[PDB]
């Protein structure tokens, strides 16, 4: 009732081809970042009555 194996321990982590870090930008300091959020969310942000939309969408 245990017997069995571990041979396979860590098989996916070790098979998952590493990815670069890439990079890019810094996102913004405290209140300024809050400000960008508020303009992007609300000012931005006009929205349509498209019956809605999304934040982390592709096509």
């Amino acid at each position: 009732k245990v017997h069995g194996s571990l041979a396979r321990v860590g098989k996916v982590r070790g098979q998952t081809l590493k990815v670069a870090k890439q990079e890019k930008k810094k996102k913004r300091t405290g209140r300024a970042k809050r400000r960008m959020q508020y303009n992007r969310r609300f000012v931005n942000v006009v929205p349509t009555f498209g019956k809605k939309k999304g934040p982390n969408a592709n096509s």
């Binding site: 809050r34 400000r35 508020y38 303009n39």
Partner: protein, 182 residues
């Protein structure tokens, strides 16, 4: 060594409707964080609770009279509150903006001397603003009534006079060493 907390988080944590409300407040009010709002939602709840207790007391009741009038007078000195209000029946029917409206940051906008709730906070936190003999760097301040008029740039920050700027003064000597001579 006595100390106390100054803010309180909301029972609950994800109520789109509340989140949007707070974000609009941060934006209008050049705020920094939710705590920044939470701190005020907290300030207000205690005031309202202070108010509600009082309002349940008998009028003329030395305790209700002596402390009610005081709460009101305190609330008015800061402009937070007005006279008809200026009784307890009106504080009960009050809100956060009314406080939020009295901080530095939004005033330095409100009379040109910033043109942004933005500009305002970096101005304040950078020492270019006195409330009359005194620099005040606390974008978080709370401008008292007859103190509204004494807010202005400071005696030396450049506007306010005084040479230029550790970066302006760099630039003057930036057209000096090369383009003048060798």
């Amino acid at each position: 060594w006595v100390c106390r907390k100054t803010y309180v988080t909301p029972r609950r944590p994800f109520e789109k409707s509340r989140l949007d409300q707070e974000l609009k407040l941060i934006g209008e009010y050049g705020l920094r964080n939710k705590r920044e709002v939470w701190r005020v939602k907290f300030t207000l709840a205690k005031i309202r609770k202070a108010a509600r207790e009082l309002l349940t007391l008998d009028e003329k009741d030395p305790r209700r009279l002596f402390e009610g009038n005081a709460l009101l007078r305190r609330l008015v000195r800061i402009g937070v509150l007005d006279e008809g209000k200026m009784k307890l029946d009106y504080i009960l029917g009050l809100k956060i903006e009314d406080f939020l409206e009295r901080r530095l940051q939004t005033q330095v906008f409100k009379l040109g001397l910033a043109k942004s709730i933005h500009h305002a906070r970096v101005l304040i936190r950078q020492r270019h603003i006195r409330v009359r003999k005194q620099v005040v760097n606390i974008p978080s301040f709370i401008v008292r009534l007859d103190s509204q008029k004494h807010i202005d740039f400071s005696l030396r920050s450049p506007y306010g006079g005084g040479r230029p700027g550790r970066v302006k003064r760099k630039n003057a000597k930036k057209g000096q060493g090369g383009a003048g001579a060798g």
